[PDB]
Amino acid sequence: LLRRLKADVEKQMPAKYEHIVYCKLSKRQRFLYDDFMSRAQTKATLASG
Amino acid sequence: DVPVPSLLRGNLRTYQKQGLNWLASLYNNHTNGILADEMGLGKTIQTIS
Ligand SMILES: Nc1ncnc2c1ncn2[C@@H]1O[C@H](COP(=O)(O)OP(=O)(O)O)[C@@H](O)[C@H]1O
Ligand code: BEF
Numbered sequence: 001l002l003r004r005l006k007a008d009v010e011k012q013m014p015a016k017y018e019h020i021v022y023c024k025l026s027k028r029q030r031f032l033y034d035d036f037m038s039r040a041q042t043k044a045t046l047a048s049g
Numbered sequence: 050d051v052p053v054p055s056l057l058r059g060n061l062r063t064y065q066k067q068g069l070n071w072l073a074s075l076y077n078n079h080t081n082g083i084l085a086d087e088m089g090l091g092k093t094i095q096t097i098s
Binding site (some may be wrong): 001002003004005006008009 | 062064068072073082083084085086087089090
């Protein structure tokens with residue numbers, strides 16, 4: 001094995017931020033989402049298959 | 050690590066020269082290993098060198 005990381009070349013590399021952007025679901029996407037949940041429940045969700 | 054630096058036109062940094070240092074023990078000892086450096090640190094510079 002031979003492994004190095006960016007901490008040895010640190011203090012010259014810029015910062016790294018991980019943002020999380022939340023976006024609410026659309027109306028037709030909620031109706032189609034609940035429609036696929038109900039129609040999936042007609043097939044018993046295929047969870048244990 | 051005692052490298053002959055001819056035909057190496059570009060410039061490499063110190064940790065990549067240490068990559069050639071740890072790469073010098075592979076072909077001279079007839080050993081094969083996996084070089085897994087952090088992405089963005091120039092493994093191709095070590096291979097070309
Ligand atoms: N001595 C150096 N000076 C400036 N840039 C360098 C140097 N060594 C490597 N790089 C940059 O680092 C990058 C290394 O990419 P590459 O070796 O192809 O994949 P990775 O390093 O992600 O495995 C190159 O695009 C190059 O521009
Ligand atoms: F590891 Be480098 F991004 F090819």
